[PDB]
Specification:
part of a larger assembly, 4 chains, mainly alpha, Ferritin, 5 helices, binds gold ion, binds chloride ion, binds sodium ion, iron storage (chains A, B, C, D), ferrous iron binding (chains A, B, C, D), Ferritin (chains A, B, C, D), iron (chains A, B, C, D)
Chain lengths: 171, 171, 171, 171
């Protein structure tokens, strides 16, 4: 490569894996969003929340690909694994699955920082800081806030709570 | 002092103590507001209500300091005691703590009027009338209204009531 | 905590201490600002400079608290120590006290970076970079510039110099 | 009188005396303002400051007269004594004379509150609160601030200080 400078093969491979995780997360959120659009589930605000996350994870993948090319790395695409469930249960079940997924992305980001730090690659570290580390923390906080409100609303009338959360928080 | 006129040392000291109470109230409301921002509490409207009160109590302290200087008194700052709790329980527990705090400020204001009246200091009495006595009564009425609505919403489904109050009153 | 990830108890405690330092700095600047509003000191531009810094340090504390909650840490408030003086002397004395205070905050920020680096916490390091390290350097440079101009203006006519600095720099 | 109610002859007389003090203060400020317009004094900002105060004291007299008529009292005008000096010395001498005059008005206002309180006349007390007590405190604070700045500027070059104060504060 004519442009590549201070860009380890280890970072290049890790960036390709992270693209694959972001795209699988996008696909998962696509599945979650259509599940909540089913006529027998019918929680529009839950569909909107997950379809917006599908878009944000795709954007994360696009950003990582653009950065791979800017550094002289080579994008390599793998199979995208189907999402872990076909049916996602309650809003609560789905928001718990989403926070597990987000913590796994966050761990992949922290693991890529550790690799970039070991490889002395400050451009990579700046890239993760600028577009990923804070966005992921902000999203996990919001999902935690959602899980607390959903859990509060379960009590004894679970249908009522699920309706009210969708109507008054996911508006 | 070249400007001081009809301004008792007793009033001067009482004004400094009242600044300390308003600043401690501001600090308490800061603590209450961040408690309701915790991911395991997550009541945004409750956070907004208390952070707005932190701002209003700071404004009260600033007004008292400005008046101290206008009369030729000397501002003296003491330690600000940490708030009375680290964790504030339910919205109900927190609004009860806030109305106790407000009644204690109101009593300090009435005590300062009594001192100003005994010292024949009509400028002080006009100052309290203009910026404090009515604002405190209006705030305590609002907190009473809130406590009545929260209490009505407890019934048997406490989580549901706490969510609905935050969503539909503290909007 | 449902959200906490890669957030050391050591960082959590250090963040709470830093909130306490920012709030004590805010309180110090409140004291400095009202001292310069005294009828026997009467330097309006000096009052405005310090009251603006009281606001900026409070903002620093609020930002640190918001970040504590975003990471799943728990805000813990301590007593706020009264400022180090009741009377602050000349503009020069006050700007020297302010630069000592600012260097002590800056050292606390650098100490928190060192802890975050030792704990491999890149989100913390990004947070300090984004809202604190450059703001503190920019402020200390401005205070140095002020101290140089004040020192130049002392010569033999100290009252004249103090008036002119307040009128023509702190405008 | 068809309208008079709860309006003591003692208050009525005190209001007429206070009109006479406000008008004499207006006349004094007229004298001060023209002195600073003399070609051999020539401090335009000092002239503007005192002529504005002549206008404000006249407004005070007009307000007291309007209130006398609203209560069914009878305005009685006396001779207006010429001002205490023909020549007013330095800006410092003049601002010292102005703060003495203002403290004497303020004492007359406090004395009228004491009389109104003894006569159980809450309308009078509200009138003084609304238009006089705070305005007088705010003015005496400003004059104190001015005296501090003038005193700072004397040092060894009194002409230079007097010029700079007029140019940069009384702008
Ligand atoms: Au959807
Ligand atoms: Au949707
Ligand atoms: Au969709
Ligand atoms: Au996409
Ligand atoms: Au996309
Ligand atoms: Au994409
Ligand atoms: Au794309
Ligand atoms: Au890194
Ligand atoms: Au790095
Ligand atoms: Au969520
Ligand atoms: Au959610
Ligand atoms: Au949401
Ligand atoms: Au808040
Ligand atoms: Au809030
Ligand atoms: Au807040
Ligand atoms: Au404040
Ligand atoms: Au404030
Ligand atoms: Au304040
Ligand atoms: Au303030
Ligand atoms: Au009173
Ligand atoms: Au009074
Ligand atoms: Au309330
Ligand atoms: Au409330
Ligand atoms: Au409310
Ligand atoms: Au100030
Ligand atoms: Au100021
Ligand atoms: Au201020
Ligand atoms: Au603040
Ligand atoms: Au603030
Ligand atoms: Au703050
Ligand atoms: Au704040
Ligand atoms: Au760091
Ligand atoms: Au770090
Ligand atoms: Au400075
Ligand atoms: Au400065
Ligand atoms: Au400046
Ligand atoms: Au004039
Ligand atoms: Au004039
Ligand atoms: Au004039
Ligand atoms: Au007039
Ligand atoms: Au007039
Ligand atoms: Au008049
Ligand atoms: Au008139
Ligand atoms: Au009165
Ligand atoms: Au009265
Ligand atoms: Au003045
Ligand atoms: Au003056
Ligand atoms: Au002035
Ligand atoms: Cl599979
Ligand atoms: Cl304590
Ligand atoms: Cl101490
Ligand atoms: Cl005479
Ligand atoms: Na290199
Ligand atoms: Na008096
Ligand atoms: Na971790
Ligand atoms: Na009567």
């Amino acid at each position: 490569s004519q442009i590549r400078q201070n860009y380890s093969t280890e970072v290049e491979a890790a960036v390709n894996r992270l693209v694959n995780l972001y795209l699988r997360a996008s696909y998962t959120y696509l599945s979650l969003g259509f599940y909540f659009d089913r006529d027998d589930v019918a929680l529009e605000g839950v569909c909107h929340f997950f379809c917006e996350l599908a878009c944000e994870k795709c954007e994360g993948a696009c950003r990582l690909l653009k950065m791979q090319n800017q550094r002289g790395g080579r994008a390599l695409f793998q199979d995208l694994q189907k999402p872990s469930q076909d049916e996602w249960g309650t809003t609560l079940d789905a928001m718990k699955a989403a926070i597990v997924l987000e913590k796994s992305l966050n761990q992949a980001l922290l693991d890529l920082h550790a690799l970039g730090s070991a490889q002395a690659d400050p451009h990579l570290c700046d890239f993760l800081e600028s577009h990923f580390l804070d966005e992921e923390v902000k999203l996990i906080k919001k999902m935690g806030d959602h899980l607390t409100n959903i859990q509060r609303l379960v009590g004894s009338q679970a249908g009522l709570g699920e309706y009210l959360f969708e109507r008054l928080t996911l508006k």
